[PDB]
Design a protein around this ligand. Sequence first.
Ligand code: COA
Ligand code: COA
Lengths: 616, 616, 78
Amino acid sequence: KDYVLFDINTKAFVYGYQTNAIQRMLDFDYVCKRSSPSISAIINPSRAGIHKAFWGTKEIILPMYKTIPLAALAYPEADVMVNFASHRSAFETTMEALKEDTIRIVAVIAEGVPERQSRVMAATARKLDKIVIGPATVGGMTAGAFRIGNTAGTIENIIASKLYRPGCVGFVSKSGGMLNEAFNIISRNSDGIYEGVAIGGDRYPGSNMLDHILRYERNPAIKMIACLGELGGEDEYMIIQALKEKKITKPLVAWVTGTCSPYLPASVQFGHAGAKANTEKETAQAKNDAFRQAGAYVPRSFDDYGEMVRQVYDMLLTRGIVQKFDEPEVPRIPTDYSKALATGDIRKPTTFICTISDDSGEELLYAGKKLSDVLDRKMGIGGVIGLLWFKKELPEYAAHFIELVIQIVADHGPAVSGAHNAIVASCAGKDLISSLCSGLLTIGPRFGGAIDDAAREFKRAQETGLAPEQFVGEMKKKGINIPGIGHKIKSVKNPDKRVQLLISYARANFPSTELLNYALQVEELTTAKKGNLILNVDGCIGILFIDLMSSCGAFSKEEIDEVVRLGYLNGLFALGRSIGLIGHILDQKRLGSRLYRHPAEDIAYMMPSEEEIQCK
Amino acid sequence: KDYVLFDINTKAFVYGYQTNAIQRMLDFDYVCKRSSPSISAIINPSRAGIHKAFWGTKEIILPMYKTIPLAALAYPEADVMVNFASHRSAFETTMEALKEDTIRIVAVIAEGVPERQSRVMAATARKLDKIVIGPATVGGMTAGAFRIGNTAGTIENIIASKLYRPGCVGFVSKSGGMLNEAFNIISRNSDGIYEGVAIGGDRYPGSNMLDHILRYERNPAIKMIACLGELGGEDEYMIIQALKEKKITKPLVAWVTGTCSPYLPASVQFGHAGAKANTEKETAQAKNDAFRQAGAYVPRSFDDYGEMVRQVYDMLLTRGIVQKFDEPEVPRIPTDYSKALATGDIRKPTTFICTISDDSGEELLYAGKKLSDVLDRKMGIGGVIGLLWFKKELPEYAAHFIELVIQIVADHGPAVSGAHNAIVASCAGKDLISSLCSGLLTIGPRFGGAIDDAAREFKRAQETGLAPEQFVGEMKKKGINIPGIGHKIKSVKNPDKRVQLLISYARANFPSTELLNYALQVEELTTAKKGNLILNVDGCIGILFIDLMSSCGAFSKEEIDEVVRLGYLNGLFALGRSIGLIGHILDQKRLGSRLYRHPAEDIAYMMPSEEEIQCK
Amino acid sequence: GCIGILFIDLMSSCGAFSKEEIDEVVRLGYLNGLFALGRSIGLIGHILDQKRLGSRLYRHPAEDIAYMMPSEEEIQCK
Ligand SMILES: CC(C)(COP(=O)(O)OP(=O)(O)OC[C@H]1O[C@@H](n2cnc3c(N)ncnc32)[C@H](O)[C@@H]1OP(=O)(O)O)[C@@H](O)C(=O)NCCC(=O)NCCS
Ligand SMILES: CC(C)(COP(=O)(O)OP(=O)(O)OC[C@H]1O[C@@H](n2cnc3c(N)ncnc32)[C@H](O)[C@@H]1OP(=O)(O)O)[C@@H](O)C(=O)NCCC(=O)NCCS
């Protein structure tokens, strides 16, 4: 019981939101034919909630807790914690898990944990009869029962190394990557591992190799012990002393890496924090020699490790210590979609097309132009709209016209429909965005819509060849006021400044103003009836926008008709009037304005009678 | 050349939106290493526009036209039309394509085309020196050059039958499915087909078998002819007469299916419209015998077809008529995502979870309950909300309470924020949906949100044990008016009917009204200050909804707190008040109401000074 | 991060805003408005782009949704 670290009933917490590691653990549980997942909960310090993962092809939900005590109280059956905290958090989180009465094993994955912190974790573990695997390890595994996080990599590797079923080998290493290579070596030269553990490469581990070797010595299922050490520190001398004191009776295969060291400078610090021979005793040579002399099976080099494994396994087969079992059913999990797509195994059709922007690359593109080029060239807001809406690099006069229109339509006081609705929502204590959309949703045929109608009606008259008099006459016959014509106060003698600013700019800077010249002929006729029948702001924008497009030269008659039809002009009004809408919402917020209720006397209540509401 | 039907430069129109058939054609062009796609445009009678498909792993755009004359004028280089119109439209569309000067070949896929219509198409084709393949065919193909729609199925089948490069065999059949089996037979017993055509199984085809056999006889690339006929009609007698008149000098393999017919009743009509032997001459026996006597290579049965093809191919090799080909590079296209997913080759994680409804199955489910069960049980609107919002089968008093609240809050006149904004949006000529949202976006802390506040504040006071006096006192100290308390006109002597209707129903029908009992103790205290400090409608809803949830018994204290926090109660107000909002919007539409502008005298303009707007 | 932080620096550079005035600007969501105004441009752009392309009605793919209906027992009131 004490010798068993993990079994098929082991339940664990995964500390840290490591979705791939979580999936790897579940995938192993599935291929091992486990009744339940090996994970009771995830500990996510940023967030409590749920996490969805696969159980084969079936999706399951795992609970997710902010703290170790909250998870432990909810899942007391979970006695293992897989700790993916960084080297900056590994100590505090391991110490907290070790203080929990229900947790027995903590696997510390982080590399770069101080030696002092590891010694304090190791001593805390020993005092409380608990186990710390790591720091700086992948963990380990019990074949066919449980895996620590990423131990033994892909499901393909688990299958190829026959890790879904136990063997007779008890394995322990310092290196994590070499633990996976060893799983492959051992499966090819024996019935495979029963259990494998990497203690990490730190000078002061949470648990020494001997701790695990002593558990393998007590386990009846294990008939063979195999270990892979390295230069630096005196850990392997605990094994050699135990081997000498007859504490390890099972045959032990042993190899210590770092035979390169005497050929190279004495100053060379190797990969693992603890891989540096300070004394001669700490060298790979002194260790391998002391292992040979203690009665362990030591190969000539790492190349003949598997062969020594093969020799020791064959000896157990002859003596009958190990019996030859039947290969269980080879398990199967479908390929992950993202792998199939990344390798080009599959092709997947796109649902959407996007021709205006691309955030996929090294740099954001607006209509194929890099954002840094848009800004280095001072294209301005008008230029950015040219790219994103018309897919054009507009000339300077066109981009400035767009920016002029935005300033001119920014606001027209609080009384208009849009500003009025935005103010009411703001007075109802709504946030800026809700209040803005409440205002924007009034923009249509009567508020902002005369821009499109003027562009539409004037373009058609001028195109179809109608003389201004004929257009004025036709519209009067149909009983339709000309869109873009008329003002309540402004007239020929008293002009609207917004109009004059727009017209003076186009006359001075537009290459062509053909629709404007026609519009001004129509205006001479309407002002001959009533002086206030001037070309208003909405008319001016729609008409000059057709002239801007005709001046660009890159738009056909059809393209221009499409621009009017699709409501690009309603968008320009919406974008500009957003400024004043946001302004009015914020203004009511600064003023601390109260809830609005329309005055009762401004409403004529005209209820239908009892007779009027009857069905007959 | 006249004998060539299709080559590697053939461009086509696909009449009918057959996305899979379009993809199949493009996939063949890709594996054949074609420079350009074999499709110039799609003809879609419902819609003009674009269609996106794959070119290997690269996505391309195909133009899409509403009519045949419009497509023909845009793409005059396209001389083939693949017609996927139904049997009800096949004639009119084929006739229109044949009248186009640029179209030479029309493949009619539809089954069930009248014999008169086919006769008229065939005669029209012969008069204009054009070709009609079909009706009731898949089409045919020139190996390594062009495929008609779905001819030869999957890309796996195209690869397995080596159809990506030509052979020496000129193939013609009546059957479409047997054309694909023949492609497989021939590839296994020769260098494969050069070209293959299925004329369809109709009694009066657009083109007879001999038309295609004569083309193969003129083509230098073809050294071998193979055909598969069937009983009924005298089509095969055109071949036998041409074989007798030495018009077919190339060796011809021939088999006529329908040898079963004399053993069965004379009344039996087989699959294909033309597969019924009216006379003895029309039988498979009379046809196979006349073929043998004419000098064709006729097998003993269909089983020996491949063997006959192998014999004729080998004879051409001995005489050096056929030269040995070197097998070109085997082409490769990735599997379609949907195939990989459907076969379980891949597993794909879902982005969303849905726990409230399911439209995937045989029948729509609301919280796992079939819609027909929801309606057969008369669960009502309140029951439907119970399922979709609370995931509960609510008791009758709870579901009726939800429906009562909806009626009570349906409207409160046009003057309130929500109705007021919807009316302004409707007066601006906006559609119902825009106008509705303009009004709904005012719903929050001051309009509708006193419901959620009354539930929250009263629940907390009553939970934490605060005596009503202590709650009234605490709120006064903080300077916070009690949410759900107070009315402008209604008082103790003159009550709000909406409140009275809600309180009376809860008192009479709720199992428990603990929070209402508390609220009434609070109300006695507030009305002791000012008579108008009554429990208002918003307070009533919030409080009674906590009591409803406590009466259900299936909600914990936490679940209830979650309901208050998530704003379920704002949703209920939104749902019910949408009725009156939609009502107001429609009312302004019926009245023909004009654009609203807020009166200028109702606004105090308080502009900052020049000094106030300066930055220091 | 860059926009929020530099906007506080812009206001401190103007000199006409007190610490309180600046806190009010952050509190009232002026910065959400600036984002809304700017991102409107690309939103209008994408809407018009789908209109030019003649894009069809979207329906989210069925396989991207995990349907997890509660049981008959789970929906009961007691
Ligand atoms: C007769 C009278 C009522 C007419 O009213 P009015 O304000 O001048 O103008 P209307 O409302 O008819 O509009 C003028 C024209 O502009 C047109 N118009 C209005 N808005 C327009 C628009 N946006 N686009 C195009 N045309 C427009 C109208 O269709 C109308 O055209 P029409 O004159 O060809 O029919 C007014 O001029 C009057 O009171 N005159 C005094 C008469 C008098 O002194 N009599 C003796 C008393 S003793
Ligand atoms: C003195 C006077 C101005 C007070 O005004 P009022 O209308 O009675 O009431 P208030 O505005 O103070 O509100 C009454 C209480 O209801 C409370 N209240 C209001 N809305 C509340 C709500 N929604 N929930 C809970 N408490 C609420 C207030 O906090 C206040 O509490 P308090 O009395 O404990 O401080 C008024 O009563 C008056 O004019 N009296 C005449 C005095 C007189 O005749 N003098 C001699 C003239 S010669």
